[PDB]
Structure formats: structure tokens, C-alpha cells
Design a protein around this nucleic acid. Structure first.
Lengths: 59, 209, 146, 165
RNA sequence: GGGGAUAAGCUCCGUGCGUCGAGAGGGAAACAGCCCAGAUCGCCGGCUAAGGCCCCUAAGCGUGUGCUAAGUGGAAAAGGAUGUGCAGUCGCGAAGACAACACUGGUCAAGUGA
RNA sequence: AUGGUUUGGCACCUCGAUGUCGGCUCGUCGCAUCCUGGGGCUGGAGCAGGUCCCAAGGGUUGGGCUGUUCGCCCAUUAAAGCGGCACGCGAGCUGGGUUUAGAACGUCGUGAGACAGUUCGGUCUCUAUCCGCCGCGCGCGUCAGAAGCUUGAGGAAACCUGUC
RNA sequence: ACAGGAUAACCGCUGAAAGCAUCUAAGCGGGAAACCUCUUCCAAGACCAGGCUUCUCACCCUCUAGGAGGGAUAAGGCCCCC
């Protein structure tokens, strides 16, 4: 959550985008990436942003 | 508000012009020398510091001697502070200026502050004026004990129980100065002022009268 | 295993928050998050890896409703009938910083670690602070849109 | 609401200064300053008047709109001609006169009674029984008038004391 | 359902009713009997139930449309009450409506009453 | 409708022990205010009251009778408040009452005996471990070691009233 | 105690919604032994452990030279003593 808010996205929207994008990395290694390699986490945030719907509140 | 440091000498008897008796306590309002000025711009509060008593120069420790030298006056035994109200009030004192007894006038009302006599470890009967229990009619070894102490099963704070008594700073208010003897630097104050003979006192103009 | 901070890992930065016309609870929560170190990806509940927080214009702070004259700050001396109460109005006009200090302190944990974290909060009623030597970074309370 | 919508005329000879909501007016009788509530703005209409424009119709604003209008009207009429309050006594032995700037009455108390004249008001006493006070602000004049009225408890029996015209 | 004053954390019966007793775990601040769910052991994996997502405290100072001024939310009755939102009626009224200056006339100027 | 201050009802709590009434000593809290303080209408002329709102800062007597609380009475006073807290307080006191064993009267029982009937007498134990509270020190801390004089966040105490 | 501040019941001033009125929803005042100051006392273990000053303001040894340990001193303090 801390690392995602550092990239202007909330944790829940990030998780939904990661699920939609099909990436199957878990929270343990997500935290490992957030602590160790910020560049990979930023790239994952971008791919999750791409995988999200255009209006998340749409029915 | 004027002020001065003095010493309690004892109490005696005098008669006023209506032939009534006045029990007067004699206070040696000896010469005081101003040693330091407390200013708002420097200390945050306005006050004046006075030195009293005569002491041998070989008795003062080096920090005290240095402070007195920086002031510019020879050391004295006792040092105390008078808290004024504003800079306009403290402008009239300057370091090295000498205060003597005549700052007070006859019939003035003064506030003497001293340290009460010591009474040692005192019981509630003496420390707090507790009424005792019966001395007879079956009372068993409770002739002087406090009695009850009185849901939470706790002795609330402030319990007026026995303990050490006396030796506290005390101010007596609205004492009348019967006479200001300028020759001996002696104030004749009607009434009883706190402390034992030879103790330090502070005489201030009354805050109320 | 999971990353754990070592002796020299923690780095602190200084933020200065302008409390003029800011909702008291909002500013208190933001400052509490900053003090706790929740915004750092290296966060760990064991360590106080937070940041120093300076709050200026504490007296200009905003209180909604009629809480200015109806919300009481209580304290008991311990003696019987030692309960004293002041509304936020007199508390603000007498000790302006105390309202913000109390609000921020109530929102961070009540452990010993909370006591150590409290050391890293400085609040001031004036528009300026004596901590210019640290070059604090101005901090603005934004919301991450989802 | 209804009264507020009508702009209050501003005489030519009296200066009106508008600084956001801080409004100051310099008239022949003197100067007075008024602060307007924040949900309402006031702009000096170029035709020799000021506009009390309420942009919302929620209860707070709709109630404050007419109040602001009548407050402005009071301010302008008090800075233009001022305000005058006339007073008097009923009964016997009640004497009133002006002693410089301060007012002294002998209502019958064992002590003389003095009233201090604040700024913006002045006392006129053309008779011991009747007298008047005048000022540039209506609120202050009313407050002092009531204060002087208070010098005797009401008399439903004899009506001895002071009463307005 | 009975007894008691349909009062009791009162008492006595019925129930292919439940739980506790003999039941851990999560929630209700704490909380045998309420809600979710029945623990063979290990994992520094994932999805959910009840309950939740400003900080304490994991996750939303979420989005859209409205309401509340009472800190209501975050305890309670008979009753009282020009609070306010919505909807429905009726009375009067540009022949000038209400106010202001029982019922009638002039000024005035749209709504005014239950 | 409130309260659990009155008698109650339940028997959840204790029978390998939770002292039972008054009184003394010492409290603390509520306000549903007895006095003092500010009010209002008076079926208030003034005096004085009636009644009512605010108000808990302080104060609120000494005796006779009774074990008493309660109560009546005697003198005063500004007033002689109502209540909660194991109907406060017996490892603080009393033992007058109640509540063992002795004895008597009335009444009941054939009798042993009995009576929320009466009468006289009748062992109240303890070296304070912990919390609490009143006082007093030792150690360490407050970024070198010391010494004078102090600011005060924060608390505590006090707050009565009459006559002329 | 005196004096000040904010107030209770209450008395008011200036006036809207609601063309008048209305101590009121905007505002502004008076108003009590209650509250905050004011009086007396404690108070920097107030861990945000405060302030103004004044005094001493330096000498060795060891391990290994990183830090530590030990010794001897200054200002001062304590013990013994009256």
C-alpha cells in the first residue's frame, strides 16, 4: 500500500488491475519488489493501470 | 510595591497616643544592596534582586564571589528576588543602590514573609486539629488516633493524616507598621511575624491594603 | 525472508505543514501518518522510521460545527473533585498549540513506541519556526484518487 | 429576502468605500464601518447605490439577505443625519441635567448617580424633566437609551420613572 | 403458552429449534449461550463468510443522487412544538391577492392562508 | 416517565465465616437549595411573604427523654437542607439494643420446653506482605563538573455571616 | 478581599426570514457567593527534564591506537568533629 500510494494508486485498485492483467505474483514478492527494486514495482503499477477499466465505478 | 530584607529580633510592648497597648514585633530591616536587575527583554520577567547580611569574604565560594564581583559589590550572606509588575516599576532601581528602612512610612501596611518554626513529626491532633476520641467510657487505645479513613477501597489523595509539620514559607498580610526607627534601621510591626528570632524575613508593601 | 531495517537504514526528512484553515482532524491524521512512517515502503511496526513534522499556524486551524464552544478537553488531577474542563475556544486562545498536539497524539499508538514517536512532532502558533536549519520540505494534504 | 432585493440609495455627498466585505462610509455626521456576511456580496451600484446580491436561496442566506440590507440602510441613514433619542421623566422630585460630558441624575437615591458618555453619543438636557441623546449609530444610541431607562424599577402603580415618548 | 403485577438475569411446559454444556478460530471494545464458521499437522501462498476500509487498525479522508444542523448519528415514553425536504388538497386573489398603512372603502404591490 | 433512598419479588454471589443497629472519629459526592448570591410575577402599596427559574462557594448550634434511627420538647440561629457511597467508616473505637449458655413474670404445652412478649447479668483477637495515602531519604537522569538566583506548565489551600 | 473576563436565570439594543413585529436565526451589550484570573502555598522526574548568570576550565598510564579501561586532580561536596 505504501509503495503503491507512492505511485499515485490505491492498494485495492492496484490489486484489481494486477488480477485483470493476469500477473500471478503474490503479496510477499510484491512487498519484496516494493522494498528492493522500485523500478519493477513502478512497471507493475503501469501494467495494472493499463489493465484497469476506464470507469472503475461503471456497473 | 516596595520591599526589603530584614531579620526578626523579638517582640515587645508599646503604647500609642490613646494609651492603648500595641504588641509590636521588632524587625531589623538592615541595609540591602541591589545586586541584579531582571528585565523582560533578558529574563522574561521584571524583578529586582537584593542582598542582605554580613559575611566574611573567605566564606563565600568562588561562583558566588564571581557573581558579586560582576555585580560590583562586596558579598553578603543572603540573596533574594523581588518580583515587580512592569519595566516602569523596575526602572527606579539600579545595581549598587542601597535600600534602608525609611522606604516605609509610619502607619503603612506591610506583608512579612518568613519560614515558620519547625514542629517535627506531628499527629493529626496537632497538625490538623482533629477532635480526639473519648478518654473514657470504654475507648480502647484510640485517645488520639484519626479514626476512620473512608467503594473503590482507596484512600483518596490529600488525606489529612499525620506527618512532618512546620518549616514552610508563610506570608502574614496587612500588618501595620507602628514606627519606623531610622537610626537603628528597625521596623516596629504590630502583630506576630513568622519564624524564630534571628531568621530572615521579607517586608513588602501590602498587596491588598 | 522479509526485509528488516538494520542500524543505519532509517533516514529522516522534515515536513512543515501549514494549518491555516485546515480541518483539525484531517491535519491530525495526515501528521500522524507522517510521524508513524506509514508512507514509506520500508515501513515496519517495530521501528519508528517516521519523519519529523513541523506544524505552523496552529492557531489558524479550522473547527467545524459549534465544537469551538461545546467540545471540552478534560483532565483529572487525582484529588477529589479535581476535574477541570476547557472548551476548544479558551484552549486555543491560551495554549494554541495544545489542541493540535492533543489531536495528533491521540491518533498514534499508545505504546512506548508512540511515546518515542511523539518526540518527532513540533507545532507552533506562529507563521514561522526555528527549524530553518533543517530545510523542511513543504507538505500538502492530497488525496489519492481511485 | 424581499427587502434585501431593493438596493438602498446612496447620497452623492457621502463617500462609500468597499473592500470586499469590509465596507466603510464617510458621511457628514461622521464615519462608520460595516462587515457583511460571507454568503452575500455588496457592490456599489454605479447609479448612486449599493447592490445587496444574494446568490443562494438556502435558509441561512435567505434570512441574512434582508438583514444585511436593513443593516446597510441603518448605517447610511446614521452616517448621513445621525440618530436622536428623546427621553423624559414622570413623577416629582426627579431632576436631570448634563455636567460637561457626563450625565448626573438625582432620582431620589441616597447617593448621586452618574452615567459616563461613551464615544459617538452626546447628551442634551433642555429641561430637568425631559432630555435627549443623539448619535451617529442607532445600535449604540439604543443601548445607552435603554441603560439610562434602567435607572428605576418599573412602576405599574404610579408610573414614576422614565418612559419613551 | 400457563403462574406472577402478561415485572423480573422470576418460575413452569411444548419445539427433527439453535448454541454452550463437551467447541477452538473471526466479529460484537471487553463478553459460556448472539452472528460467521466445526481445529489431523506444516507453509514468510491464494479466495472468501460475519464484520469492515480518516488515524489507533489490515483494507475506500471510493463514485453518483438526495437528506440532517440536532454531534442527531453516538439510549426512552405520554405528550408538546411557525425546523426542514417531498408529494397531495382546498380557501382567497391582477376585477390587485396577504401583510402593512369580526366586516367595508383608498394606497401599495404576488402569491397568501389551513 | 426517572431513581434504585422504602417495604418488596428472584435466589446469580458467598455456610473449608461478606460484623448485624445506633453513637464517636474522619470523610467524599449529587442538587431534587435550609441560609447567604442574582432574578420574575405578584391575588406585591412599603414591610413581609406566596410561588416559581439560575446557583453546590462556604455554612448548616447546644441540651432534656429514649439503645435508639425516627420523634417530641427546651433555648437559640442567617440557617438549623434532602440524599448516595456494604442503609460510608468495629485488622479505627464503643457493646446501650439485637443474637448462645444463668434467672424471673405473663401466656402456650400433660411434659421436656416455647414466645419477629417483657426483665437483670453476660470474653469485640491480630507484630501491615501488596495496593492506597501522609511524610522522609538513597540512586540515577536532565550530553563536561559545579554553585547562586529563579520562570513557571500543572496542582493544592481559602471562599461563612450578624448587629449597630 | 478589591479589581478584571466569560457567563447562568434575566433585562436589553440593533432587525430578518415573515413589506409589520420579533432581546435572534447575523450581530452587539449588561448580568451571581458558581467558572477563569485575582490571594496563599507546592511545583523542571514539566523525559519538551526550562531560564539568567558565575566558577573550574586540566594531567597521566594501560590495551591497542577504535574505542575503552584505570589513576591523579581543579571548582565543589561528603564523611569525621563542635
Amino acid at each position: 500500500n505504501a509503495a503503491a500510494r507512492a505511485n499515485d494508486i490505491t492498494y485495492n485498485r492496484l490489486i484489481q488491475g494486477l488480477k485483470a492483467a493476469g500477473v500471478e505474483v503474490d503479496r510477499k514478492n510484491l512487498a519484496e519488489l516494493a522494498v528492493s527494486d522500485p523500478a519493477a514495482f513502478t512497471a507493475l503499477v503501469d501494467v495494472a493501470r493499463a489493465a484497469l477499466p476506464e470507469d472503475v465505478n461503471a456497473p | 510595591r516596595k520591599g526589603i530584607l530584614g531579620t526578626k529580633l523579638g517582640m515587645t510592648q508599646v503604647f500609642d497616643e490613646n494609651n492603648k497597648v500595641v504588641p509590636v514585633t521588632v524587625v531589623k530591616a538592615g541595609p540591602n544592596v541591589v545586586t541584579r536587575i531582571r528585565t523582560t527583554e533578558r529574563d522574561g520577567y521584571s524583578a529586582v534582586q537584593l542582598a542582605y547580611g554580613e559575611i566574611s569574604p573567605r566564606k563565600v565560594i568562588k561562583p558566588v564571589a564571581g557573581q558579586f564581583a560582576a555585580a560590583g559589590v562586596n558579598p553578603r550572606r543572603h540573596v533574594a528576588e523581588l518580583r515587580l509588575d512592569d519595566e516602569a516599576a523596575v526602572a527606579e532601581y539600579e545595581v549598587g543602590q542601597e535600600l534602608t528602612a525609611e522606604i516605609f512610612s509610619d502607619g503603612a501596611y506591610v506583608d512579612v514573609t518568613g519560614t515558620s518554626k519547625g514542629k517535627g513529626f506531628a499527629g493529626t491532633m496537632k497538625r490538623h486539629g482533629f477532635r480526639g476520641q473519648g478518654a473514657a467510657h470504654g475507648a480502647q487505645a484510640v485517645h488520639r488516633r484519626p479514626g476512620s479513613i473512608g467503594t473503590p477501597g482507596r484512600v483518596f489523595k490529600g488525606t489529612r493524616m499525620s506527618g512532618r509539620m512546620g518549616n514552610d514559607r508563610v506570608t502574614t498580610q496587612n500588618l501595620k507598621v507602628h514606627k519606623v526607627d531610622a537610626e537603628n534601621g528597625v521596623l516596629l510591626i504590630k502583630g506576630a511575624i513568622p519564624g524564630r528570632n534571628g531568621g530572615l524575613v521579607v517586608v513588602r508593601s501590602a498587596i491588598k491594603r | 525472508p522479509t526485509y528488516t531495517p538494520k542500524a543505519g537504514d532509517t533516514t529522516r526528512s522534515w515536513y512543515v505543514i501549514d494549518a491555516s484553515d485546515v480541518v483539525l482532524g484531517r491535519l491530525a491524521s495526515a501528521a500522524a501518518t507522517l510521524l508513524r512512517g506509514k508512507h514509506k515502503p520500508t515501513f515496519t511496526p517495530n521501528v519508528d522510521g517516521g519523519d519529523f513534522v513541523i506544524v505552523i499556524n496552529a492557531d489558524k486551524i479550522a473547527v467545524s460545527g459549534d465544537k469551538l464552544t461545546k467540545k471540552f478537553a478534560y483532565r483529572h488531577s487525582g484529588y477529589p473533585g479535581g476535574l477541570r474542563k476547557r472548551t476548544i475556544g479558551e484552549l486555543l486562545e491560551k495554549h494554541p498549540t495544545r489542541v493540535v498536539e492533543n489531536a495528533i497524539i491521540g491518533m498514534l499508538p499508545h505504546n512506548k513506541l508512540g511515546r518515542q514517536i511523539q518526540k518527532k512532532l513540533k507545532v507552533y502558533a506562529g507563521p514561522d519556526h526555528p527549524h530553518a536549519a533543517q530545510q523542511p520540505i513543504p507538505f500538502e494534504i492530497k488525496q489519492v484518487a481511485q | 429576502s424581499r427587502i434585501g432585493k431593493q438596493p438602498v440609495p446612496v447620497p452623492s455627498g457621502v463617500d462609500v468605500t468597499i473592500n470586499g466585505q469590509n465596507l466603510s462610509v464617510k458621511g457628514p455626521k461622521g464615519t462608520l464601518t460595516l462587515d457583511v456576511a460571507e454568503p452575500i456580496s455588496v457592490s456599489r451600484a454605479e447609479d448612486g447605490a449599493i447592490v445587496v446580491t444574494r446568490p443562494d436561496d438556502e435558509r441561512r442566506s435567505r434570512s441574512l439577505h434582508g438583514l444585511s440590507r436593513t443593516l446597510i440602510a441603518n448605517l447610511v441613514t446614521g452616517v448621513t443625519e445621525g440618530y436622536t433619542q428623546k427621553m423624559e421623566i414622570f413623577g416629582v422630585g426627579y431632576r436631570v441635567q448634563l455636567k460637561g460630558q457626563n450625565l448626573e441624575f438625582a432620582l431620589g437615591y441616597s447617593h448621586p448617580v452618574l452615567i459616563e458618555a461613551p464615544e459617538g453619543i452626546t447628551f442634551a438636557v433642555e429641561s430637568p424633566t425631559k432630555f435627549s441623546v443623539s448619535g451617529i449609530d442607532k445600535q449604540k444610541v439604543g443601548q445607552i437609551s435603554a441603560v439610562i431607562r434602567r435607572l428605576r424599577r418599573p412602576d405599574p402603580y404610579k408610573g414614576k420613572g422614565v418612559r419613551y415618548e
